[PDB]
Design a protein around this ligand. Structure first.
Ligand SMILES: [Cu+2]
Length: 228
C-alpha cells in the first residue's frame, strides 16, 4: 500500500498524482502523473489483469503535463513508505504515445520493459527483493532511460508487484504508476511493446508464486522480455 508522490527526472523534481487529495477535487492541479481512483493506496490483482485498470491503475486518466529526460539519464521514483511485508519485483516500462501523451488513448499503449529487478537473496524465505532495496534507499527507485532509445513522447509505467499473498490465485498485488515523459537526445532503438491488458496472467509463474517456501528455483520476473 503506497503511491509515488513525485519523481526526479533529469535533475528536476515533478510532483506526482496525490491520490489522497486530487480525486476529492473538481479541478485538481495538472501533473505529469496519471490520475487514478486508487484512494485506498491499493492495487490491481489478477481479477483485473485484463481490465483497463491494469494499464495505469484504477480508472486512470491522462496526465496533462510531460517531463523531459535525456536518453541515458536517470529517473528517481519517490514512493510513500513501502511495507517490508510487501516483498516483490520492481518493473519499469515505456510505451510510445506517437504524439502528445496528454491525449493518447491508454488502451492503445504497448509497453516495453526497460528495467526489472526481482529476488535478490532467497536463501532465507521470504527473502530479500527489489522492494526491500527500494525501502533501504529512502523508499526510492532509480531507473536509467536507455541512451539508445528513440527520442519521443512516452508513458513511463513503474510498478511494484507485492507477492505476500501470491500463493493464492489472483493473490499478487500490482501497484502501477504512470507518468508522461519526453526522451531527448536519443538513439534509434525502440522495443516491440505488449498491450497493458496482455502484460500479466493470474497463472504466470512469477505471479502465482509462493515466497515462503524454498526459493532454490529462483524467481522468474513476470511480464514481457527486457529490452536490451
Ligand atoms: Cu498494501
Amino acid at each position: 500500500h503506497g503511491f509515488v508522490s513525485g519523481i526526479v527526472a533529469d535533475g528536476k523534481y515533478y510532483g506526482g498524482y496525490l491520490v489522497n487529495q486530487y480525486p476529492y477535487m473538481s479541478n485538481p492541479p495538472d501533473t505529469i502523473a496519471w490520475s487514478t481512483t486508487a484512494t485506498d493506496l491499493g492495487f490491481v490483482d489478477g481479477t483485473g489483469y485484463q481490465s483497463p485498470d491494469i494499464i495505469c491503475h484504477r480508472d486512470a486518466k491522462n496526465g496533462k503535463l510531460t517531463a523531459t529526460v535525456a536518453a541515458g539519464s536517470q529517473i528517481e521514483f519517490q514512493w510513500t513508505t513501502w511495507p517490508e511485508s510487501h516483498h516483490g519485483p520492481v518493473i519499469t516500462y515505456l510505451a510510445p504515445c506517437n504524439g502528445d501523451c496528454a491525449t493518447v488513448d491508454k488502451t492503445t499503449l504497448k509497453f516495453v520493459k526497460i528495467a526489472a529487478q526481482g529476488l535478490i537473496d532467497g536463501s532465507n524465505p521470504p527473502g530479500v527483493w527489489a522492494s526491500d532495496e527500494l525501502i533501504a534507499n529512502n523508499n526510492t527507485w532509480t531507473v536509467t532511460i536507455p541512451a539508445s532509445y528513440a527520442p519521443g513522447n512516452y508513458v513511463l509505467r513503474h510498478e511494484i508487484i507485492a507477492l505476500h499473498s501470491a500463493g493464492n490465485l489472483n493473490g499478487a498485488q500490482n501497484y502501477p504508476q504512470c507518468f508522461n515523459i519526453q526522451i531527448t537526445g536519443g538513439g534509434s532503438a525502440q522495443g516491440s511493446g505488449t498491450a497493458g491488458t496482455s502484460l500479466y496472467k493470474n497463472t504466470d509463474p512469477g505471479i502465482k508464486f509462493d515466497i515462503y517456501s524454498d526459493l532454490s528455483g529462483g524467481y522468474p520476473i513476470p511480464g514481457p522480455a527486457l529490452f536490451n
